[PDB]
Structure 1
Amino acid sequence: RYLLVRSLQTFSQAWFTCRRCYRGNLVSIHNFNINYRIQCSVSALNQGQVWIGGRITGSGRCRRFQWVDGSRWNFAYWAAHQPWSRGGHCVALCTRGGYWRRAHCLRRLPFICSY
């Protein structure tokens, strides 16, 4: 299950909210059918995107893409043209098109929790 939190929060604040207000986690997405369903759930928002639970971790050359809910990173739906290098280490889903974009973790956005 998943739900939309309309409140604007940083990725870290949102990670906390999903865990404490809903006993869940910022959502992980493993296939297009679920990405589309979440896309539909946020289509009418005035904000351009919402936090999902993805993060780029590590230092130096070798890093990893992880879901805060620990699930495997086996699917993505990245916007083809977006600032990438130095674009941020948190992942957001665009309300229009359902594409994912890297975004700076300290920016505040609405978000999706799974429970």
Structure 2
Amino acid sequence: RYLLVRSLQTFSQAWFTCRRCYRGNLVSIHNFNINYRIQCSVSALNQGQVWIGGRITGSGRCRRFQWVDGSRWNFAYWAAHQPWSRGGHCVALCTRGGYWRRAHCLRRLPFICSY
């Protein structure tokens, strides 16, 4: 069960909002079926992307890709073209096509909470 929050917020703000207002977490995606259903739900928004629960953590050369809801990173649907290196440590889903893109965490966007 997931829901869309139209309010524009930074990654950290959204993280908080999903937990306190809905007793959930920024959504995590584990298969094409769900990624597509989420895609359809936001296909009309005016913004080009929405925050989902993904984050790239770590320092140095060895890092990791995590979901704020603790589940495992076993699926991804990355956009073929996008600034990658230095492109950001937070993950967003595109309203068009449903592609995932790296984005700067302090940017304000709509987001998906699960519960």
Give the TM-score range, shorter chain: over 0.9
- State how far apart, in whole Å, the 2-side matches of 1:86 and 1:71 are: 25
Offset of 1:49 from its aligned partner?
A: 0.1
Question: Aligned to 1:92, what secondary structure does the other structure show?
Answer: strand
Offset of 1:95 from its aligned partner?
A: 0.1
- State how far apart, in whole Å, the 2-side matches of 1:63 and 1:21 are: 31
Question: Aligned to 2:37, what secondary structure does the other structure show?
Answer: helix
Question: Aligned to 2:50, what secondary structure does the other structure show?
Answer: strand
CA displacement, residues 91-114 of structure 1 (integer Å, 9 cap, x when unaligned): 000000000000000000000000
- State how far apart, in whole Å, the 1-side matches of 2:101 and 2:64 are: 16
- State how far apart, in whole Å, the 2-side matches of 1:93 and 1:84 are: 15
Q: Which runs of no fewer than 5 residues in structure 2 stay unpaired?
A: none
- State how far apart, in whole Å, the 2-side matches of 1:21 and 1:43 are: 24
Q: Which runs of no fewer than 5 residues in structure 1 stay unpaired?
A: none
- State how far apart, in whole Å, the 1-side matches of 2:100 and 2:46 are: 17
Aligned residues: percent identity? 100
Question: Aligned to 2:40, what secondary structure does the other structure show?
Answer: helix
User: How many positions carry a matched residue from both structures?
Assistant: 115
Question: Aligned to 1:38, what secondary structure does the other structure show?
Answer: helix
**How large is the Cα RMSD of the aligned pairs?**
0.2
CA displacement, residues 45-65 of structure 1 (integer Å, 9 cap, x when unaligned): 000000000000001100000
Question: Aligned to 2:35, what secondary structure does the other structure show?
Answer: helix
- State how far apart, in whole Å, the 1-side matches of 2:33 and 2:65 are: 21
- State how far apart, in whole Å, the 2-side matches of 1:60 and 1:5 are: 34
- State how far apart, in whole Å, the 1-side matches of 2:30 and 2:72 are: 8
Task: With the length of structure 1 as denominator, give the TM-score of the two structures.
Answer: 1.00
- State how far apart, in whole Å, the 1-side matches of 2:97 and 2:59 are: 31
